[PDB]
Amino acid sequence: ADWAIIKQMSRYLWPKDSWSDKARVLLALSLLVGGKVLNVHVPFYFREIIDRLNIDVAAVGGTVSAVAGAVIFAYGASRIGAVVSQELRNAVFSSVAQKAIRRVATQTFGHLLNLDLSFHLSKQTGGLTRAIDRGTKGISYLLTSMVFHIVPTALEIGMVCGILTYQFGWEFAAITAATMAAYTAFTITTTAWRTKFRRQANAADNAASTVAVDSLINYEAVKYFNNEAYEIARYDKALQAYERSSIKVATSLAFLNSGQNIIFSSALTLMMWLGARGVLAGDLSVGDLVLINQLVFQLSVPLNFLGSVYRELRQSLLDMETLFDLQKVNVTIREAPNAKPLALPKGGEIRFENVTFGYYPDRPILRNLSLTIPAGKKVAVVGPSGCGKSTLLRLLFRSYDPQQGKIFIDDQDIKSVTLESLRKSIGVVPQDTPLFNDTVELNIRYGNVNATQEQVIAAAQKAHIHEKIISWPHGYQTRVGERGLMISGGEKQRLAVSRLILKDPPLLFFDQATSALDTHTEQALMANINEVVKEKKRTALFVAHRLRTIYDADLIIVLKEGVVVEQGSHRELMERDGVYAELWMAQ
Amino acid sequence: ADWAIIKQMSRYLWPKDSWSDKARVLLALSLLVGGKVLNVHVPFYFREIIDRLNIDVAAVGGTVSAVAGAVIFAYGASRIGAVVSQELRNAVFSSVAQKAIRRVATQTFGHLLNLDLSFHLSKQTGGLTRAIDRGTKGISYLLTSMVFHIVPTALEIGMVCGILTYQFGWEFAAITAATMAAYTAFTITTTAWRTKFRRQANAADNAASTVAVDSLINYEAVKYFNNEAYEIARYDKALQAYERSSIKVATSLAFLNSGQNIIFSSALTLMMWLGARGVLAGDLSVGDLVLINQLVFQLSVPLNFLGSVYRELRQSLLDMETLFDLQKVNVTIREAPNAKPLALPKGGEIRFENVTFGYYPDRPILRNLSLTIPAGKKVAVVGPSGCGKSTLLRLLFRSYDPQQGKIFIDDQDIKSVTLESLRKSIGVVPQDTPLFNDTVELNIRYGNVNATQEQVIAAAQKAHIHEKIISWPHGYQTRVGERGLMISGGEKQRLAVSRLILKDPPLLFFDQATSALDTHTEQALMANINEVVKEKKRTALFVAHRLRTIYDADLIIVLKEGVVVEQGSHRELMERDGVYAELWMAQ
Ligand SMILES: Nc1ncnc2c1ncn2[C@@H]1O[C@H](COP(=O)(O)OP(=O)(O)OP(=O)(O)O)[C@@H](O)[C@H]1O
Ligand SMILES: Nc1ncnc2c1ncn2[C@@H]1O[C@H](COP(=O)(O)OP(=O)(O)OP(=O)(O)O)[C@@H](O)[C@H]1O
Ligand SMILES: [Mg+2]
Ligand SMILES: [Mg+2]
């Protein structure tokens, strides 16, 4: 299972473009091998010191150079060389690992921004970004563990087994092979038993994080309804589950490490018994026994390093499948192949044909819908609340596809049109208008990020917000706060209208753009919007509950129960005495 | 500096309540000392094996029991005992560490929920929860490092210095003291040089995380204005800064580890030179030399463990000051001492007296404001957009304090009244109404979490939303999505009205509660709200831009430029021919 994830992740070890990080990888591998070779030499120099001081105890000599000085310096310099080269390849491979981090994070964020609207509506705000940054931390930790601690250790077992089989009998090879067999059997058994606790801890951690994020987003809601203790209790219960699972994780890791060190230390005892038997039989010397012990002990050091941090490693593994499964989710809003960009031969003629749509398959909202928005005219869509008139503005934008029927913009099915050209041809003021946690000028220029300050000021006049922004102390640098909450709702809505004005699209969709404005302000703003639409011959589609802003619309579409019940102008709908008349007579 | 943070954190080692986690701490410390003692015995048993196999090479014997069997088993069993007791105290102290994690996280979340509104408006959504969970990870990692790797290592230097000074000369004590001096000097110098890179990496990581979170919150904004590439580029630049700083961090950690291992291995070489000189002079034996080397090497193992994970440790330290500084921020909205709960002798008579307020000190918004909301009457506050009429509803709630003047609810200054009683006496429908990412029924029952299903259904009828919820497939279990975006805005607003209805407060504040509703729906909802207010004699304060919902209000307050320009009823404001007349004649 996880072998597939490791195979997919291995492409970041071997990039095919830069060729300089390839040189860094090769240099890190060469320093890895050199460090392991020096680390395996240092027991040989210790054996040489032991033997030269043991056999030369009878003759009188000095330790400066006569007996053991050169090999003392050799031992010290080889220890220094081993550790220095290990840290040097750590420093070298750090750059490759961090470049892989930035590339993975940017790619995954870019895939997130192209996912469907339904996924982003049904997710949790904290969960996605937690998956992103925790997955990047996982990539970094797992790459650094595999290159820094796992491969060097496996190479250490390789050379230790080879040297103990070469310089000594096959008995040591048999002992170490049985040790690796028992070690692997114990490790896989206890890992198959440790997986439940570690996935439960991750699930409870995610639950606690989502509780905290959802409580902090709705801080005004928790203070308005005095549910601070309720949110604290919810967070506390989630953390109770998390600490129970984490205690089980740690308690079962201290069984893994304990048992695998039982196996390793029993191996060390048996090998030292074989060495003692060899020493007493005259085959081996004291230095050979200390060589055996030192080799196996220097093998122990990386092994209990891996045992100590196994929690973080395998945590990064389940972070691997959660982030990669986030990358593997498909998009249901896909461009048809060989798709031409959207063209507007005449004005933005929008035509719905037999459109049937429901976010849930058992509840159709638009039911056999068929409406024709004329080209270049101001068109108003009215109706009861929840009737499905702001679901036009997100299904015409192709955030959702109809189950039946087709949508045409100038006789072009929007399914057979590139998403990029369609979404640049449509500008919409959303019903709720959250702003980025930045200044006023940045939020205004978000409509066209490469627009100059004069265009931003012009869109500020056209949205009837500029004089207020001048009257403020910070001017256009006034911070709007989190989700545009440090300014008033009417000013925030006018900023959204300013974004639409600065974008200047052929198709304009206003989803109650004057809902939070007083009568004078909405009157002036509607005057500016109407003269913009009439001057540029834009196809403007106004979804509005305030009928007094759209009584001069060219076409008024009354939408009830997801079907057009009546169309026509204001006066025609008055002599129809229909649903629009009942809406208007109720003032 | 950081010593103060460690002192403050040390209270979680010594809890004063449970006394059972105190027993766990003592058991972990006892197993710590026992494991270190056994780990220091195992070189002594290796020395004994070496000596018994060296001096007894002349006489013929077997290794089973005659020469070295008992001490081979002693060596192996002591190694097993050391590692087993180390992992056992890790398992024991894990529970104490995790309980400290849950307590710290719950306390810090609770302090966050009681902070000021201004702090929550001016913060970043990702940043606070990232600080919380990353600080909890820091608490866990730093406690486990200090009890698991730092104190055991310091105890190891203690016993290694003591044993080498006891069994051998003062020369080894002088060498090891000079080694500790050089080690500490190098470590503090390179740590003072490493702090810049590690704080820059944390700052860039926070910047990248905030960019990602702000982009994902505004997914509809980035798709509506086609700024996916812009957000990807912003995230990529932040990640560029992060990877540059992380590469510098790792490159400077591989200098710390390299140099401190230079110092340690030079110490080991010098001590083995002294041991060789002692062996050649007849004072020492071969086993004593291997004892020296084994003691110092088993000291090396924890030291390069700390060197390998020093990044994570000191990262947890700067997480310590960021989370603790989050806990040290004060609240400016504080209850007066000896504060009595809010009483309502007559109805909810609200009176503003000379109130002067501005979120920025250089821009007053309410300027010498003086209005008197009568008791038990429906009162409407109208005015231009941005005039400061929804800043009444958050300054009467005491989310902000006035700079000058006082606010009275039944002749009780709300500054001299407990926040809990004041905020339970006030229920408000906010201007924007985000919902929790849960079902419809949970969002409705958030008004009173301990209310039964019949009361939830009753508030659903009174908010004119129930029949729609029945018509849905999932009923009251319909998920509303992130921030209530998987339902329509009118239905979301009616759910907020339902929360206010279920809360049933004495004071009702509606901040444009019918802004996203059609004329029939707002007419029916206003009928239900008006009969609720009249039946229970509630003091209802309606902030509304739709004047047709509040033409029957008992008092209409016209608020322009932050001062009451005119009051009175609808008819009186008509014969005044003032600002309200100009609002109404503009229809
Ligand atoms: N995923 C979804 N996204 C949007 N609406 C959904 C979804 N699932 C179910 N619905 C329901 O489908 C209906 C679609 O109506 P729509 O959202 O267009 O109303 P609206 O025109 O926005 O009304 P208003 O503008 O007054 O809020 C809503 O009542 C909503 O409750
Ligand atoms: N942190 C802040 N939160 C809210 N408003 C702020 C803040 N800082 C400054 N302001 C300004 O203070 C004024 C307060 O007015 P308020 O937000 O009550 O207007 P409003 O009643 O919401 O008008 P509308 O309902 O038409 O948007 C606003 O004009 C706003 O620009
Ligand atoms: Mg709508
Ligand atoms: Mg308002």
Numbering used by the authors:
A (entry chain A), B (entry chain B): 92 to 678
Sentences from the paper on this structure:
Previous studies suggest mitochondrial ABCB7-type exporters are involved in maturation of cytosolic iron-sulfur proteins. Here, we report a series of cryo-electron microscopy structures of a eukaryotic homolog of human ABCB7, CtAtm1, determined at average resolutions ranging from 2.8 to 3.2 Å, complemented by functional characterization and molecular docking in silico. We propose that CtAtm1 accepts delivery from glutathione-complexed iron-sulfur clusters. As anticipated, the architecture of CtAtm1 harbors the classical ABC-fold, packing into a homodimer with six transmembrane segments (TM1–TM6) in each monomer.
To generate an occluded configuration, we again exploited the E603Q form, but this time we supplemented the sample with ATP and cargo, thereby resembling conditions previously exploited to catch such a state of NaAtm130. Then, the cluster in the sample was replaced with GSSG, which permitted us to determine a structure at an average resolution of 2.8 Å, CtAtm1occl. Indeed, surface analysis reveals the TM-domain to remain inaccessible from the intermembrane space of mitochondria, but now also from the matrix side. Yet, TM6 remains kinked in the structure, in contrast to occluded states of NaAtm1. The overall location of the CtAtm1occl pocket across the matrix-membrane interface between TM2, TM3 and TM 6 has essentially not been altered vis-à-vis the matrix-exposed cavity present in the inward-facing conformations, and the highly electropositive surface charge is also maintained. However, interestingly, in the cargo-binding region next to F396, the pocket is divided by residue pairs Y232, V400, and E403 aligning directly each side of the pocket with the two pathways separated by the TM6 linking pairs that are present in our other CtAtm1 structures.
